[PDB]
Amino acid sequence: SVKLAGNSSLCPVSGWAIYSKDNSVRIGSKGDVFVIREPFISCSPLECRTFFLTQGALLNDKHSNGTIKDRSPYRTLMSCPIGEVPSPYNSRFESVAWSASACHDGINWLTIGISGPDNGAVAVLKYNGIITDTIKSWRNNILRTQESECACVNGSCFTVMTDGPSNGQASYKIFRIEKGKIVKSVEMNAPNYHYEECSCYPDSSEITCVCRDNWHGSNRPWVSFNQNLEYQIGYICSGIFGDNPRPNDKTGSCGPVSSNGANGVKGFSFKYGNGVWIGRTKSISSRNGFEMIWDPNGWTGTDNNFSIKQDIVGINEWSGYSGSFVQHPELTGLDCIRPCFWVELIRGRPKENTIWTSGSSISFCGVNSDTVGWSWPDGAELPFTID
Amino acid sequence: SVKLAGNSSLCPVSGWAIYSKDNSVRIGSKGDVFVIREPFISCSPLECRTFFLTQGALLNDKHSNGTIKDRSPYRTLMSCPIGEVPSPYNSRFESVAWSASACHDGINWLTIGISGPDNGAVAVLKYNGIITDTIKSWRNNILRTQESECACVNGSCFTVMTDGPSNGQASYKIFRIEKGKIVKSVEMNAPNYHYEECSCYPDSSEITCVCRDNWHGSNRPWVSFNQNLEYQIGYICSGIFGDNPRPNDKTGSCGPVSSNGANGVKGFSFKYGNGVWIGRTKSISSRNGFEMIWDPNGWTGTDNNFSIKQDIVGINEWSGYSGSFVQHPELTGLDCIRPCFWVELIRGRPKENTIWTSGSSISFCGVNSDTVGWSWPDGAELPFTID
Amino acid sequence: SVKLAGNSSLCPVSGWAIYSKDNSVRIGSKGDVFVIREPFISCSPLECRTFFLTQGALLNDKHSNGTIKDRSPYRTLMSCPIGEVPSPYNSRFESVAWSASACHDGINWLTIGISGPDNGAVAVLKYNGIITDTIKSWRNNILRTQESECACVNGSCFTVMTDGPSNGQASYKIFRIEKGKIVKSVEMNAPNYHYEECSCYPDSSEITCVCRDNWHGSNRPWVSFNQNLEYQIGYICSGIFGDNPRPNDKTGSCGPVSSNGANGVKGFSFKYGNGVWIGRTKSISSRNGFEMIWDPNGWTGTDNNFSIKQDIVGINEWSGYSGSFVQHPELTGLDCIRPCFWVELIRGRPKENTIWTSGSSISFCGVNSDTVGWSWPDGAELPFTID
Amino acid sequence: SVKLAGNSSLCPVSGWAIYSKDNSVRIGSKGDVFVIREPFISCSPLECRTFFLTQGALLNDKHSNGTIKDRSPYRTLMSCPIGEVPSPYNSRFESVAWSASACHDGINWLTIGISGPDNGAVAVLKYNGIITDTIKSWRNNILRTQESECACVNGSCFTVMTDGPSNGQASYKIFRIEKGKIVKSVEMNAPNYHYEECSCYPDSSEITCVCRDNWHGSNRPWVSFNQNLEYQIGYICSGIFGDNPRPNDKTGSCGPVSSNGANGVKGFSFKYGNGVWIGRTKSISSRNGFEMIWDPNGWTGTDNNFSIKQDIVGINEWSGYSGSFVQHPELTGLDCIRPCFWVELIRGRPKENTIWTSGSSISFCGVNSDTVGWSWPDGAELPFTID
Ligand SMILES: *[C@@H]1O[C@H](CO)[C@@H](O[C@@H]2O[C@H](CO)[C@@H](O[C@@H]3O[C@H](CO)[C@@H](O)[C@H](O[C@H]4O[C@H](CO)[C@@H](O)[C@H](O)[C@@H]4O)[C@@H]3O)[C@H](O)[C@H]2NC(C)=O)[C@H](O)[C@H]1NC(C)=O
Ligand SMILES: *[C@@H]1O[C@H](CO)[C@@H](O[C@@H]2O[C@H](CO)[C@@H](O[C@@H]3O[C@H](CO)[C@@H](O)[C@H](O[C@H]4O[C@H](CO)[C@@H](O)[C@H](O)[C@@H]4O)[C@@H]3O)[C@H](O)[C@H]2NC(C)=O)[C@H](O)[C@H]1NC(C)=O
Ligand SMILES: CCC(CC)O[C@@H]1C=C(C(=O)O)C[C@H](N)[C@H]1NC(C)=O
Ligand SMILES: CCC(CC)O[C@@H]1C=C(C(=O)O)C[C@H](N)[C@H]1NC(C)=O
Ligand SMILES: CCC(CC)O[C@@H]1C=C(C(=O)O)C[C@H](N)[C@H]1NC(C)=O
Ligand SMILES: CCC(CC)O[C@@H]1C=C(C(=O)O)C[C@H](N)[C@H]1NC(C)=O
Ligand SMILES: *[C@@H]1O[C@H](CO)[C@@H](O)[C@H](O)[C@H]1NC(C)=O
Ligand SMILES: *[C@@H]1O[C@H](CO)[C@@H](O)[C@H](O)[C@H]1NC(C)=O
Ligand SMILES: *[C@@H]1O[C@H](CO)[C@@H](O)[C@H](O)[C@H]1NC(C)=O
Ligand SMILES: *[C@@H]1O[C@H](CO)[C@@H](O)[C@H](O)[C@H]1NC(C)=O
Ligand SMILES: *[C@@H]1O[C@H](CO)[C@@H](O)[C@H](O)[C@H]1NC(C)=O
Ligand SMILES: *[C@@H]1O[C@H](CO)[C@@H](O)[C@H](O)[C@H]1NC(C)=O
Ligand SMILES: *[C@@H]1O[C@H](CO)[C@@H](O)[C@H](O)[C@H]1NC(C)=O
Ligand SMILES: *[C@@H]1O[C@H](CO)[C@@H](O)[C@H](O)[C@H]1NC(C)=O
Ligand SMILES: [Ca+2]
Ligand SMILES: [Ca+2]
Ligand SMILES: [Ca+2]
Ligand SMILES: [Ca+2]
Ligand SMILES: [Ca+2]
Ligand SMILES: [Ca+2]
Ligand SMILES: [Ca+2]
Ligand SMILES: [Ca+2]
Ligand SMILES: [Ca+2]
């Protein structure tokens, strides 16, 4: 076993090839499948796994009642091989958690699981399944983290956590973790910024995170930093707004776009020079549809012009959270870090007449060969027998 | 790990010994078993696996509704150990696909999964579960492939794909793939020929494929080629017609036999000099029964005489697709490549009054010791509780 | 990996310690558990597994209907770790079979599975899951075998098969198998003897089998042989009759005991000099209860006196088949071959008012430390919801 | 593989971080989950496992009827990865048992499973799944053991067993076990003491056990011993009484506290010099709630003052058994033995109107970083559909 270098650049990509689809909700109609949300993908040098937050209950069972609720003592972080349904019969237990992150440094898995009360939550860090550290809420207001993979470079892994209001100024910290131990942290000096649920990836020995402004921005905030946690911050400038909800496309801003800025959804983007690959819902008002857009000057430019659009989920179909994940050369044999992404397909409450809320997933990887747009939706027929 | 040589000849065989039976549909009446079709077997130097195209749903669940449908965003290629039922709890995810192929080169698994719209489908190639290449539809008319194992020789794997009409002249291409990367391809110059769903096997460093003419041939077309993709084409001459539907046996043709030539079923045959082992349905008009026939001059001779017939499935029982698979000396310890075959036993629509369509499987391997004919049918009692 | 020596003697034992219990029928009431019969245990140098003949159906499902039937194309030999329920989710597929045997030579598993028509059945032999040989019925009357583990000595494995009437003189053959290949066989010259379902074990480089006389013997026939298949035959002389049905205990015979001699049940015994450990039902008329009896001169003596009796299953509880299995020094680290045994607990038809027949299992190993008698019955409550 | 040294001291700890939660009962409402009680955790140098005593039945099935019953022939010791639900599809079979213990010596698993009649029960010892020894009841009155992990030091493992009345003076023995073989035992000379269900852990090459006085003590008895079984005995002196039921906290005793002394619950404590970490229910009269208390002089001091209290389960929630388990440096890479604990959350009879009784589990590990109290209850809604 050797630790991931993380020193190569992102692979340039022209399109996205479908990588996985689990059909979790369809199968859970009869099969024993966990009620889950906040799924994400992360890979080791050997395999890729789907991580997810269970509700400690199964689909089509009475205990799925009220699962629109975000935090409870019953939620646990678990994982299974990519593309398989999250079942009690194929899932590895990771941590007790209602907010989480995970990543592999080349040697072992790091998992971060936050549980406990809203006014004093504690993140439990595990390395190879052994508790190695903890960090407790510093603002006493729902300590929370990525809900996607952390990023590793030369034996160090990095994540971002938030503590404070979800509708106003909060506090944001970056962490450097080695063998499950926090070796350094810094609080971001980001007045008037809002960071939630960051999607972080490694690129040329540094980390880039694209996050969610739940306070007053319909474009996405970003933070980038080196291994010493020296950071820069900003917002994606493109007039192709990335959050949901959001305004119709027009002239963007390199600061938070106030129009339709409140609320949001976890998302991601990949930076290539001044350009950006943007993943976003198709609807401006609800979590419906999904598309990938290549905007060659969208990181720093404010116009609403773009070069490529690829359909992922039809506008009449439910989507939800999305996040980045990468495949290192140690896994692929390539000379660059390959960008991939996943999409959570949320079914149930609040928009559908069920007693439960749960999601399935799809994932794609970036390639330079031919690709095609389509719609790969959840496909479940609601309501269920339980309702 | 070492590459399969694929340079020895096919083992001569006098009969077929039963190798596996999964009873998938019988078990799916209660258990959690995928709705599937287009199953096939492929082996590594260590194990044999059953691959299959799920419908992203389980038997006896409402989501099995309308699974007579061939192509959808929900279909996925998965695999499980041979003889086991295809379940969410024992199946490995391979690819998102409504048409597929797979094979092992001695080092890693190659999988090919085609998804996307009918007018621009994309084949995604994976090597050891990592995307290594893609190929997009070139005729914009349902890019499709074998639905059985590809064939590997000295580190190169080979497959055939079709694009264009299924009821007239189409386009057929042969591919050479190394470590999941397409290194060469050629379009077959085959006017008045039709190739669908090829069953390909290695033999003395070259590849032989026996396929399905869905246009105007009740005998089977074949294509053989060396590692450089230098090919030959023809039709099996035997008056023992191999396709379904077909006419009663009589004088055959070395070209397409037009009588009952439209439509068909995936099948296979093994060539031994001028002779051929033919696997076929027992019924000339429907997918019922199965039998193996040895015809000592059937590859090139047009008479309807044969030497050996072995019963596999009774004529009053449902059958379906069939395909070849081989076991290499690297797996068996033999000095030749052993021929085996599988049969898909289709239940449900359109011939049965259910809301669903699904199949189970049986498989056999060629031996020179004593064997016996019998009937090993699906055995499920329809309809089910869901209907 | 090294082949088992099989050259040491049986470990002397004073009693039997419970080793496993699967509770299959109890669990199958809700869980997905195969309908099975004819289970048996066999061990490798690393683990012990339960082999069994499925009916290609699950408990409490309609396809369990009529499973009193012995032979069908749907029956398959499968295996799982000892003590676990036989489920589609934890069972390895072995062979298509309605009669079977299996054993490990120290290097790989040998399995023997008989399927096909009653008038021409074929035994398929597999070594490490690869077909290595076949043997076809020679009397055209239900070729059949042990339904328990074969016996291995220095790289050779041995079994017994029967072909012919089950109610009169039949034909019995011994086989020597190396790496799945039959290298020698001999037909036993046994006029007026009847051998069915032999329980065979290795002891001092030779094989001893205790079997079932279904024709006209209420005591058990035996056959012993060396690696060259030079054999001796006889019947257990003890007045403690071992079969079921049988007469009340009295003066025995070294030939077949005609009284209540027709019919029978698979059983076993362990020979120690002139002494014998006898496992048998508690009832003389039905498959109820089970007990182990140490009879210090019972192999050759005809009296009905014994020294030790240990209860295994209460007389008011269902039992069924029983068989021997051994643990070699290569597995245990002992300087002798340890004797163990299993008992099949049959539930359902014909004695119970259900539509199905299925069994669970218990097993015990011989020790020289303290033990105790008790009753470890199936424990299921019949009928089931399916009936 | 190398033997665990067990020669380092316990890691000092300031609080407890949550390690696992299985949600077994919630999931068993639909999924196939064993009815269990008496769960416990034990680790090897590679992984941690949950052991448990099944009732040979699944939740929400009719065979769960009457599972308040403690001892039957159907109960089995099985294990699964920590945090996973105990299911037939993910559980390893260990032994037939209605009382049990297990631990890993660094090389292999030792399991101890007691079954048989109340008047002559037999403990079966297995090393790497092979029977290595047995010990039979010496008082003919329910031979019984820890219901938690045994303790290993330098290749020797240690446990405590009890035989005799559970409501008066009984007999208590300490055992030293090497490779599954009992090499030494001693009967504790403990007049007026009562020992049940000991929680034992290694510390500086010696063993410390904290147990349950079911006769006449509301504080917990303890026994400590070296590898030669030279022992000391006493009771925890703290006025913070550890058993359930118990009186309100007040002046304690270094002998058995008679007030509310009859009956009790399995529990644990960790000794640090004169101090003690006490785990106990929150209710003084029933198995409700759970908390960890640090009492700096509680081992030898009788006052009712303490320094730290951490909530684990709310007082309005069901708890049950609790036990210690440790993680050795060979597993963690630390320079000390890390203390952890588990809690059984019992649902059903006798306090709830169901036909069944079963439990789920949570576990925590000691750390010196920040922690938080909360409530992590079972969370199931009773009754179930079966009742
Ligand atoms: C998922 O959760 C939902 C929400 O809880 C749940 O729907 C609810 O079911 C309960 C129980 O049937 C309903 O509660 C009843 O409401 C009526 C008025 O509509 C009251 O009169 C009832 O109270 C009477 O009866 C009680 C019990 O005998 C007495 O204790 C009480 O004093 C009264 O006599 C009772 O409260 C509730 O109305 C619904 N809510 C909604 C929005 O439908 C649903 O059943 C859950 N689904 C599953 C599968 O668990
Ligand atoms: C397990 O198998 C058993 C045995 O087959 C099965 O019990 C049987 O169920 C069938 C179907 O209900 C019964 O068959 C009927 O018998 C009656 C006389 O009792 C006949 O009148 C019926 O025939 C009429 O209806 C048919 C269908 O419409 C017509 O085709 C026919 O011409 C007549 O009009 C019919 O044959 C049978 O009586 C029972 N047998 C016993 C012994 O109970 C059971 O249902 C199976 N269980 C499961 C779970 O599958
Ligand atoms: C508490 C702030 C946070 C970010 C805005 O809220 C989230 C919004 C979510 C959503 O918009 O779907 C669901 C989340 N599981 C949640 N996180 C937690 C810890 O509750
Ligand atoms: C589209 C042409 C093709 C070959 C004739 O049709 C097939 C016939 C099939 C059939 O005759 O059963 C079902 C197939 N799954 C299918 N392949 C795809 C891709 O839909
Ligand atoms: C056919 C002869 C044979 C031995 C008497 O009958 C058996 C009796 C059995 C029994 O007495 O329970 C059930 C068996 N599964 C069976 N074997 C086969 C192959 O059918
Ligand atoms: C027989 C004495 C013993 C300890 C007091 O009783 C126990 C109390 C238990 C309890 O208080 O919950 C349940 C146990 N499973 C049990 N142990 C056995 C073996 O039946
Ligand atoms: C990337 O990391 C590897 C491994 O340490 C190193 O050998 C290599 O020089 C680095 N590549 C570049 C371009 O710096
Ligand atoms: C087949 O390939 C093997 C491995 O390269 C080689 O050793 C052998 O000579 C070849 N056999 C023939 C007949 O060419
Ligand atoms: C099957 O599909 C048809 C067409 O939509 C629908 O009417 C019917 O309700 C479906 N059946 C089930 C059981 O869902
Ligand atoms: C097999 O492939 C290797 C690598 O390309 C090549 O060197 C060798 O000649 C090939 N063997 C044969 C028999 O063609
Ligand atoms: C048993 O077999 C072993 C392994 O071959 C051999 O070394 C040994 O001598 C044999 N033991 C006896 C008692 O013959
Ligand atoms: C503990 O045991 C290890 C392994 O034998 C040994 O190296 C070490 O010296 C011991 N530690 C102490 C403090 O005795
Ligand atoms: C539970 O056991 C009692 C006593 O035998 C019995 O009356 C009742 O029917 C059982 N309940 C179920 C659901 O089996
Ligand atoms: C550990 O056990 C070994 C083998 O018995 C022994 O030689 C050694 O002295 C022991 N170590 C300690 C620290 O006692
Ligand atoms: Ca926003
Ligand atoms: Ca732009
Ligand atoms: Ca089920
Ligand atoms: Ca045709
Ligand atoms: Ca011919
Ligand atoms: Ca008889
Ligand atoms: Ca005698
Ligand atoms: Ca007490
Ligand atoms: Ca104190």
Residue numbers in the entry:
A (entry chain A), B (entry chain B), C (entry chain A), D (entry chain B): 82 to 169, 169A, 170 to 306, 308 to 333, 335 to 336, 339 to 392, 394 to 412, 412A, ...
Manuscript excerpt for this entry:
NA, which is a sialidase, catalyzes hydrolysis of terminally linked sialic acid and functions as the receptor-destroying element of influenza A and B viruses. Additionally, influenza A NA is further classified into two groups: group 1 (N1, N4, N5 and N8) and group 2 (N2, N3, N6, N7 and N9), based upon primary sequence. Group 1 NAs contain a 150-cavity (formed by amino acids 147–151 of the 150-loop) in their active site, whereas group 2 NAs lack this cavity. NA inhibition assays were carried out and complex crystal structures were solved for laninamivir, laninamivir octanoate, zanamivir and oseltamivir in order to elucidate the structural basis of their inhibition.
Therefore, we also solved the p09N1 oseltamivir complex structure at a resolution of 1.7 Å. Binding of oseltamivir to p09N1 was indeed highly similar to the binding observed in previous reports and is also similar to the binding mode of laninamivir octanoate to p09N1. As observed in the other available oseltamivir-NA complex structures, in the p09N1-laninamivir octanoate complex structure, Glu276 indeed forms a salt bridge with Arg224, creating a hydrophobic pocket which accommodates the hydrophobic oseltamivir pentyl ether group. This hydrophobic side chain of oseltamivir is favorably parallel to the Cβ and Cγ of Glu276 on one end and at the other end is pointed toward the hydrophobic Ile222 side chain, which contributes significantly to the high level of oseltamivir inhibition. Oseltamivir contains a 4-amino group, instead of the 4-guanidino group found in zanamivir and laninamivir, and is actually more similar to the natural ligand in this regard. Therefore, the orientation of the 150-loop during oseltamivir binding is not a major factor. Instead, the binding preference of oseltamivir for p09N1 over p57N2 and N5 may be instead explained by the ability of Glu276 to adopt the conformation that is critical to accommodate the osetalmivir pentyl ether side chain, which replaces the glycerol moiety of zanamivir, laninamivir and sialic acid. The observation that this Glu276 conformation occurs in the p09N1-laninamivir octanoate complex, but not the p57N2-laninamivir octanoate complex may indicate that this conformation is more stable in p09N1 after ligand binding which may explain why inhibition of p09N1 by oseltamivir was the best relative to N5 and p57N2. Oseltamivir inhibited the activity of N5, p09N1 and p57N2 with IC50 values of 0.83 nM, 0.54 nM and 0.79 nM, respectively.
